[PDB]
Design an enzyme around this catalytic site. Structure first.
Site, PDB file in Angstrom:
ATOM      1  N   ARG A  87      -6.887   3.523   9.475  1.00  0.00           N
ATOM      2  CA  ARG A  87      -7.045   4.554  10.533  1.00  0.00           C
ATOM      3  C   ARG A  87      -5.831   5.493  10.523  1.00  0.00           C
ATOM      4  NH1 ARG A  87      -9.710   0.174  12.422  1.00  0.00           N
ATOM      5  NH2 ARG A  87     -11.365   0.319  13.989  1.00  0.00           N
ATOM      6  N   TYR A 119       5.097   2.902  -0.457  1.00  0.00           N
ATOM      7  CA  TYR A 119       6.162   3.776   0.107  1.00  0.00           C
ATOM      8  C   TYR A 119       6.430   5.005  -0.780  1.00  0.00           C
ATOM      9  CZ  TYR A 119       6.523   0.923   4.221  1.00  0.00           C
ATOM     10  OH  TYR A 119       6.250   0.347   5.428  1.00  0.00           O
ATOM     11  N   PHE A 391      16.883  -5.854   5.055  1.00  0.00           N
ATOM     12  CA  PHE A 391      16.644  -5.430   6.452  1.00  0.00           C
ATOM     13  C   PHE A 391      15.182  -4.983   6.514  1.00  0.00           C
ATOM     14  CE2 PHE A 391      18.184  -1.604   4.331  1.00  0.00           C
ATOM     15  CZ  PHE A 391      17.230  -0.692   4.714  1.00  0.00           C
TER      16      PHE A 391
HETATM   17  N1  LIG Z   1      15.539  -9.777   9.385  1.00  0.00           N
HETATM   18  C1  LIG Z   1      15.106  -8.818   8.563  1.00  0.00           C
HETATM   19  N2  LIG Z   1      15.039  -9.004   7.276  1.00  0.00           N
HETATM   20  N3  LIG Z   1      14.760  -7.637   9.106  1.00  0.00           N
HETATM   21  N4  LIG Z   1      14.708  -7.504  10.476  1.00  0.00           N
HETATM   22  C2  LIG Z   1      14.852  -6.311  10.938  1.00  0.00           C
HETATM   23  C3  LIG Z   1      14.574  -6.041  12.370  1.00  0.00           C
HETATM   24  C4  LIG Z   1      14.921  -4.810  12.912  1.00  0.00           C
HETATM   25  C5  LIG Z   1      14.690  -4.520  14.245  1.00  0.00           C
HETATM   26  C6  LIG Z   1      14.084  -5.472  15.031  1.00  0.00           C
HETATM   27 CL1  LIG Z   1      13.780  -5.118  16.705  1.00  0.00          CL
HETATM   28  C7  LIG Z   1      13.726  -6.703  14.529  1.00  0.00           C
HETATM   29  C8  LIG Z   1      13.971  -6.983  13.195  1.00  0.00           C
END
Ligand SMILES: N=C(N)N/N=C/c1ccc(Cl)cc1
Ligand SMILES: N=C(N)N/N=C/c1ccc(Cl)cc1
Ligand SMILES: N=C(N)N/N=C/c1ccc(Cl)cc1
Ligand SMILES: N=C(N)N/N=C/c1ccc(Cl)cc1
Ligand SMILES: N=C(N)N/N=C/c1ccc(Cl)cc1
Lengths: 391, 391, 391, 391, 391
Positions: A87, A119, A391
């Site tokens: 969507r 991506y 991350f």
């Molecule tokens: N732990 C990771 N590999 N990535 N986590 C990134 C993350 C970023 C913002 C929030 Cl609110 C929660 C998790």
């Protein structure tokens, strides 16, 4: 469906979507710690009442060639509900965040990709390469030229946080791909170092003045040690840490996720013992502002001054002059000599991919092979590009 | 035990040792074909009556950076009887052949290593890298920028030998690591293309004007196609051949042993689909004559003229001047600025390993980091180094 | 580095080294219980500040042929830091403990070996053999001659400790390889009988007046029952316990680590159903005092009185006279008729290895084959040698 | 040994036998919840002091063809001690419970079989078929005719109990094999939805107005989602739930234990993607009262009125007249036209097995093939027979 | 590219494409035997010079419910060159053959599908179901009611061809899915019965007056017997053959590809021992002429006379009257009461799929549930639908 910045009321809905979307979901307590890196207006949600989509970015500091640190928007926590596929929610969330990221003045955005096929179309190119080496340490013998051969100490991670932080801080400023690791991520890292019932075993550290290694025995393979992180700021530290890891006499194999230019294989009499068991794209880059990014990084002093015209597809056309390790990148309507999509530029930017390799796939078009050799040499990094943390 | 050149009477004893030493032993008929590449005095045997050790070299032509072809001694058929281990037979046979190779005027010797830990101490360094890619072709989609998308034809290998020979001959002259493939090795290759009872399945060819691919279904995994050889002289040919291979709709996976700079991953929307499943040292080089080898190869035109003093351990000390893509390498007793063992020089020689990577392992010693960056750039190859065929 | 007996301050450093060295590390609470078996001056550490090496012995009681119980020093908790390999720390710690053990008046020392290649050079010989039998109980039918076929009861281990202790105490006094099991080790055993989250399942006991079996379902293979311990003081008890184990109708296979002379296979119509799936050295012995040990054990009454001269390499030369199941072992300078290293004597001592087998490997040298047959017969044990518990 | 109804004192002995007999033993707290479904005099134990055998039944409500709900005795918690095999304890316990069940007025008894070879001789026939489908959801594309393609919502199971209960209650009244699920079993189900340390991961729900699906990621295979339960009361709900499950983009495969007539394969362009990976007998039926059971269920309106004489082996002989979807079943001494064991009747009763299939195995004997076709058609269910939940 | 009937010159090009397309390619000699079943104008090729595409049909005789034999066009040898994917060659070849098949007067076409996702869009529906049963014959015990328990003989297949032919000819006339097996296919079958070097082991036959089984030990699993073919014309023959197969005492498991209604499981005391290890679509049908096909097959005599209006998507609209096991199917413009695509009709036609199952997936649309029950009952086959042989 509507896209908007999330209220405090949205976060339980976001954690439910997170839990259902990410098998490695760190849980609400950890998520709340990472959340401290998300700026005001750093997040978007799509509601139908309930959260059916979300995406955010964190404020990061990325080291690029020349030891230059860029403010970087780290995209993360991207999910669409299994009920709301196809969507255009992802396309809508990425468009809104990219607008905010660009208006906020970030020259680059970055992410770790859950799949390789998503991506590229949003302008992200893979910019670092993860390289898993597995060493059969029972046969491992260090070369006569290998540095060292009692500088390393076996320690409890939680008792030497300050020393790890100081070594990492030196490492990340020195290495393209380096990220500043804030206090909350050190909190999270040293919490993962503890054994869990039915989970990972206890982590140990090998500590040198100029390097550390964190490792743990594998949950199910009790003859495998996995190095979660090795940071070494000198060659002596890197060798001394590997001598200590090869000294884990109860292990048959030592595994580490490193970079393609890791010198470990050359430290041994048999280079083949350091087997490449896995390779994958690490960090992905989207260049948000082409002139700001191209002018910010350092270039190879070896290549002679040269000028060209670079056109990025739907990203502008620039007069690019590189000399004495610096670039000047200015608007032009002159005929393009090089064309590429924005994602290709992200892939060249840290020195992980050769312009001539991308040209051979026609991702990068020029009619000048001399220009190709000059781009290759100029965009090359003297310090090998590494991956800091996911991350 | 005595070491001597083998008489015609020695060859049945050599074939017995071969059969007992090499599980892939090609058999007496094939061995007799390869034997035509062994010069007079190209072989040594150690007898106790019976043959307990053997080694030989073949006359080869190796392409090095700058499209320069060197006469190369290809060591092969090296074996010590399981009854005569640890009596220095290998060291004695390598010393005698190296003497003959050097006296004959070969600037380099080369081999494929059965193990990684043997050949370093005899001055051989790994100089090419084998990279196995496995593609899940069910998910493989070519990028919009990918060249092509009816130039390729499915054919019987034995009916298009002349076209394969012509494409290969263009390929090997153009690519560092290229080897001249004599008529007997084309005879042997197209004999392996036939199915064998309880053996490999039938080979098929994909033929383009500027490239070919030879492939066969795996003996036991009937959803795996293995590409034994893909030679492409243009990017268009390389893409067109991969479009045809991704068209093998009865296969789940296509595997190929290629080089690290293969552009295949960048031809697809998902670069991750081209998985690196295996990596290993390919060709090993021993530089027999340092000045002849260093002066013969071309160097990167990008790096500015520079001069240094290179000392090879038990290999001499040289004033090395590199400028305008050429090196001059002359005797000196001036203080060394760079030191390395002979094997390290073989590893740098074709551009597969970076001087700065070997320095980080202390295999290459200098007190000048600017000199290191200049060596890295100068020894780099514009055309990626590839592996021609195993010998 | 310095070697010394550990202060109370050293024990956290010892537990860290333990945790990093032993994947099965029982944790500080359990370690503190085992520690009650370590005499004053029973432990050594090597410090660099931090503990880089440790070793200790426990006071044990070992049953040897003739139902004789010897005071035995049980070496355990031996570790060298991965940072301090190849600095002779193990050799230094073993030399110091062996000196203390000998000065304390122990006739033998013993250990369980983490690897087979370490302990031979310190005079330890493997003296018991672990034999894993796996029974496909779906096909298991007891022979008509098999004893029995309601004497056994299914019970909770923690509710019948007293009965297990009494059966074990009868067993260990009767069987060469038997060890006294102190109260703390019963505490530890019945604590391991409880299920753990993400760990082992709950243990059950089969209790007979003259035997018990402790078993648990395997964590991951839910059709495998593993017998941790079966102690039977009569043949009737042994058969009755195996009838009950073959009655575990939800299991496909029952596994047990037993001894080579376990009669289970002969209890079944198909002896092949009791498959040997694993074999390994169990207890290792170092004879500290040759005359004390040789005179302490009983010998086979069947062999006729004979005299010889035994020389142990760096262990002395003795006139050995064996008759009426007793040996006299006195100093002599008479010509040796039998020579062996100290480790070989440990291997013969409990009757697990035949003198003629060790002679065939030249670990034991004599020029008299009649003497060999007499040693074989005399050192044989009427009661098969078994392994009590790992330490 | 004696057989009697258990006192409150017997229940710890029953839980010990349970723990030793059932690897999936739910533990004393859960067992105490299920126990609320066991009527007074619903349980038997055999004591030797200790409990060596046990069996019980629960009061259940089973839906049979024609949407008729029968009171059903659900046999469960059946175990004989491994110490007391082959003493007829099972036969003695089944005889006593069957007597109580028949005297209590239950027309049918039912069970889930731990093995396929036990329950046939006590008159139980397998009456439902479990069919595991595994979908490679990466290739799954819905057919153009497929219903739907935002009606489904991803939710936390514990927050929508009332909606699940209401959907299930509609489902079980409508489907042969349906069971009433009492409040305690909803308590138990939603307690299993929580993640356990070293155990199952967290469960999620997909909720539609007319259906739900409960699923969780597999403990060890992190690319497998297992659907524990999918209940859909309309075709639209069934398709909408499968669209949402195919939307689990982080999963490679989705698995579900369903019935042979599940329409999922026909919802996809490639029916082969829904692979049958496992099949097994589900619910077993013992017809306690042949006339009551035969007259209670509805029959196919399509077959014309017909009359026959059915003899059940040691179960009586009946004049059976079927017309207008109803049967009349009365005592007769007329010559039998159909004979079968009681277990065969249980297998026909819900429509899962064809009379002509059982005839071909000679489990059902007639000399009239027209009678066979009429039985097949009459005993067929318009609504496919499904399995509600294991007990 | 051009589509045309192949000349004799095209056949080497067709065999090359065959060899490259089909891993089980039977080779030119076998292909030339199958070719005798291809009528004049039965084949099409697409040339670019070289053959880039091909498809053909064979003249077959298919048994449908009511023991009616239809002339059937068996599509086979369908391939597109990997070089010519996604150019509509398959669509062009299927359109041309379907035109020829329809003009030739075939009421149905049939095929075996290499993948499940291809043939639905050309009007083919899967019409038979392959069901692999694997029996652990070590536990297999025949039920007391099982027929038999010396009528079967172990024989060499090549010595009893006439008896196999006669049994098969009786079988194929009696069973929906039956195919006439011409002499050339008996030649091919009994040639596959011979052992091959590095290939399949020798085949044996079990011969009964009213049935046969052909089996061979698996190439690599030497405890697995694979039944290639079991044809039984009586229940006695079927049981007698399975008693003989369970008598293969050197085998642990017996495997057979059969149909879902195989009575084998019911011949054993433990029905669970006959495990379903694999399921797949067998024969696919395209109804070429709806009225001819619907009127040709017999229908269930049990359902009462009923009339409806069936519309096939792009296949016509018919007044369908079914009574006394016969259908009349005539053109109408009356309002449709049932709609379905042509492929769905092929899936119903032999009785393998229930109309109500296809309705639940919306592949078959009606607003009358009574009509659905009547279609289900009428299209049901008294003799279970089986698969004859792959083509
Ligand atoms: N732990 C990771 N590999 N990535 N986590 C990134 C993350 C970023 C913002 C929030 Cl609110 C929660 C998790
Ligand atoms: N086939 C190979 N991979 N290497 N074979 C090389 C060879 C060289 C000389 C003789 Cl006489 C026999 C064999
Ligand atoms: N649990 C074992 N298998 N051996 N453990 C022996 C031990 C002995 C002394 C101390 Cl302080 C700690 C542990
Ligand atoms: N959880 C099951 N699958 N069956 N459990 C049935 C049960 C019935 C009665 C008692 Cl007292 C305990 C358990
Ligand atoms: N052997 C098969 N399973 N199918 N083979 C069918 C075939 C039909 C015609 C030709 Cl010309 C060749 C082969």
């Amino acid at each position: 469906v509507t896209l908007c910045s999330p209220t405090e009321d949205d976060w339980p809905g976001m954690f439910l979507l997170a839990a259902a979307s990410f098998t490695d979901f760190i849980g609400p307590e950890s998520a709340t710690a990472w959340r401290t890196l998300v700026p005001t207006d750093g997040a978007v949600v799509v509601r139908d009442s309930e959260v059916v989509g979300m995406a955010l970015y964190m404020d990061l500091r990325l080291t690029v060639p020349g030891e230059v640190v860029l403010p970087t928007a780290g995209l993360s926590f991207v999910a669409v509900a299994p009920t709301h596929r196809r969507r255009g929610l992802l396309r809508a969330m990425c468009a809104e965040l990219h607008r905010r990221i660009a208006d906020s003045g970030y020259p680059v955005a970055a992410l770790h990709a859950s799949e390789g096929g998503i991506y590229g179309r949003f302008g992200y190119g893979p910019a670092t390469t993860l390289h898993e080496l597995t060493v059969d340490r029972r046969f491992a013998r260090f070369h006569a030229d290998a540095p060292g051969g009692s500088s390393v100490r076996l320690v409890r991670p939680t008792e030497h946080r300050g020393e790890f932080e100081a070594i990492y801080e030196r490492w990340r400023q020195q290495v393209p791909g380096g990220l500043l690791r804030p206090q909350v991520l050190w909190d999270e890292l040293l919490a993962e170092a503890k054994a869990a019932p039915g989970g990972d075993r206890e982590s140990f550290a090998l500590l040198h003045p100029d390097g550390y290694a964190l490792y743990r025995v594998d949950r199910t393979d009790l003859k495998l040690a996995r190095v979660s992180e090795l940071r070494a700021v000198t060659a002596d530290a890197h060798c001394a840490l590997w001598r200590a890891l090869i000294g884990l006499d109860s292990m048959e194999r030592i595994s580490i996720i490193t970079h393609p230019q890791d010198p470990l294989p050359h430290l041994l009499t048999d280079t083949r013992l350091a087997r490449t068991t896995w390779r994958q794209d690490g960090l992905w880059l989207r260049i948000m502002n082409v002139p700001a990014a191209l002018e910010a990084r350092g270039y190879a002093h070896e290549v002679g001054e040269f000028s060209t015209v670079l056109e990025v597809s739907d990203g502008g056309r620039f007069a690019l002059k590189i000399g004495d390790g610096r670039a000047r990148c200015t608007p032009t309507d002159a005929a393009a000599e090089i064309e590429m999509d924005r994602d290709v530029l992200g892939s060249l930017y840290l020195g992980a991919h050769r312009a001539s390799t991308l040209a051979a796939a026609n991702r990068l078009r020029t009619k000048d092979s001399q220009l190709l050799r000059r781009l290759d040499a100029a965009f090359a990094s003297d310090v090998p590009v590494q991956t800091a943390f996911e991350f």
